[PDB]
Amino acid sequence: TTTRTERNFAGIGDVRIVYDVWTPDTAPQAVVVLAHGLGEHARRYDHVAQRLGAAGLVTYALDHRGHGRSGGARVLVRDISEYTADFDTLVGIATREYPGCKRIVLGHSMGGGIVFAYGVERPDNYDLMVLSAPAVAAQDLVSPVVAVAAKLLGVVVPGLPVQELDFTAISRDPEVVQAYNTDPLVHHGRVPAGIGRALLQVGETMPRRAPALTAPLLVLHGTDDRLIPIEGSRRLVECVGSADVQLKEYPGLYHEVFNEPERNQVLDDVVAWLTERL
Ligand SMILES: COc1ccc(Nc2cc(-n3cc(C(=O)N4CC[C@H](O)C4)cn3)ncn2)cc1
Ligand SMILES: [Cl-]
């Protein structure tokens, strides 16, 4: 009952940014603008958009530069502002197309870092924020060696590999891990210096900037997340300015709560939270 329409816009640097619009066959109650994480793409969110559409929400979801169907050197970025600028363009598209709708910004992992960074820069451009295991404390995740390498090299050689990732940690469903590994649109390499630098840009300023986030905020995190420790989300909710902030911890879930076996429970919680607050 929710149909997908694929479009594109010209991002920073004239990069082709592909995005999906998911429209339910019911009067739209709000728009969701969704940012995926490192190395994935927006078509890993079909079921999320479909569940949101069943609640009457319209979802806009882009493939970030260097990801999925969009253009750009794969996983290449030099500054967090490249990602947030294209996210801002997508928010503006949704705004001009549904000007009577509240706007929800939703991000997972690196995309949660993008959404947080957007949210502190444009805190009056959206109404509600939802974050899935947001990468807002990346500095606590690498050795100082990787952090120095990324900071010094991320503008000059943004494609240089600086860290391996355990792709088996994305989900405890082997079918999800298998589908990731066999997806031709997904990045199967290492974390490069440029994305490293961008994540550090978010993580190093999060405590100082999070007071500017005053919109209602929902954070979702699996307690068994081995990629982004849940301790970082616990710290995030202590630093934001919002009085209406919640961390929903899911015991035993891995990183991708929206893809875990319990995903329909997770998405029920998101829909309940959103419906209370629109
Ligand atoms: C400074 O440079 C670095 C610093 C820290 C690290 N450490 C990390 C990073 C991640 N990330 C996972 C994502 C992501 O968006 N994902 C993956 C799962 C889904 O596909 C979305 C982004 N970062 N996971 C675990 N350890 C690496 C380099
Ligand atoms: Cl690589």
Side-chain angles (χ1 to χ4, degrees):
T1 33
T2 311
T3 65
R4 184 186 70 92
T5 301
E6 183 171 322
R7 294 194 282 164
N8 59 46
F9 66 85
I12 302 290
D14 298 327
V15 178
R16 178 198 63 265
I17 302 298
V18 172
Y19 64 99
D20 301 307
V21 189
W22 298 81
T23 54
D25 51 357
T26 312
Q29 297 306 136
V31 292
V32 176
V33 188
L34 186 156
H36 67 79
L38 168 60
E40 53 168 354
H41 52 82
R43 297 301 309 271
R44 298 191 75 222
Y45 292 83
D46 287 15
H47 56 301
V48 177
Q50 283 156 0
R51 178 68 189 88
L52 292 176
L57 304 175
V58 176
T59 302
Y60 291 72
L62 80 177
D63 290 358
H64 305 302
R65 63 191 41 237
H67 289 77
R69 304 156 287 174
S70 294
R74 294 300 90 169
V75 293
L76 191 152
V77 79
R78 285 178 171 82
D79 196 88
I80 184 65
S81 63
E82 299 182 44
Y83 287 150
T84 61
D86 292 347
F87 191 75
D88 183 72
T89 298
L90 188 61
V91 173
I93 295 168
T95 298
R96 288 187 293 263
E97 295 187 340
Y98 292 86
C101 281
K102 293 196 175 184
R103 291 189 292 276
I104 304 147
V105 292
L106 190 150
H108 164 69
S109 203
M110 176 181 86
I114 293 164
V115 169
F116 172 84
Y118 178 80
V120 299
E121 290 282 349
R122 307 283 313 270
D124 296 328
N125 208 25
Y126 60 93
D127 297 284
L128 305 169
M129 178 177 296
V130 181
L131 303 175
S132 163
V136 293
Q139 76 278 357
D140 295 313
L141 319 188
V142 270
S143 71
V145 165
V146 174
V148 169
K151 264 179 284 175
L152 291 174
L153 302 164
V155 180
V156 175
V157 281
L160 192 122
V162 300
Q163 168 122 135
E164 250 107 9
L165 282 200
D166 182 11
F167 291 120
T168 75
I170 69 179
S171 175
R172 62 199 221 283
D173 180 359
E175 238 167 333
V176 167
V177 175
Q178 170 184 311
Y180 186 90
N181 285 340
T182 65
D183 189 333
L185 286 178
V186 157
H187 177 66
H188 301 105
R190 285 147 299 182
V191 182
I195 287 180
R197 181 180 180 268
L199 290 174
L200 291 176
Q201 288 180 292
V202 177
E204 291 178 342
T205 59
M206 179 279 277
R208 316 208 65 92
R209 304 285 253 113
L213 203 166
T214 60
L217 172 60
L218 170 60
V219 187
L220 325 159
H221 212 126
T223 69
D224 272 341
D225 189 336
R226 310 193 279 96
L227 294 174
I228 295 185
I230 190 161
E231 289 69 24
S233 290
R234 292 178 181 149
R235 294 189 270 114
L236 171 66
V237 296
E238 290 297 336
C239 297
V240 295
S242 320
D244 183 11
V245 57
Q246 293 185 23
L247 170 54
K248 293 193 160 170
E249 308 195 0
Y250 292 90
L253 270 62
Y254 277 24
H255 183 51
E256 295 181 352
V257 293
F258 293 145
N259 298 331
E260 282 282 81
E262 300 80 1
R263 57 187 171 276
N264 285 314
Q265 308 185 28
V266 177
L267 287 164
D268 281 347
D269 292 343
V270 171
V271 168
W273 183 91
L274 288 172
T275 50
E276 301 284 71
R277 281 167 184 75
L278 285 172

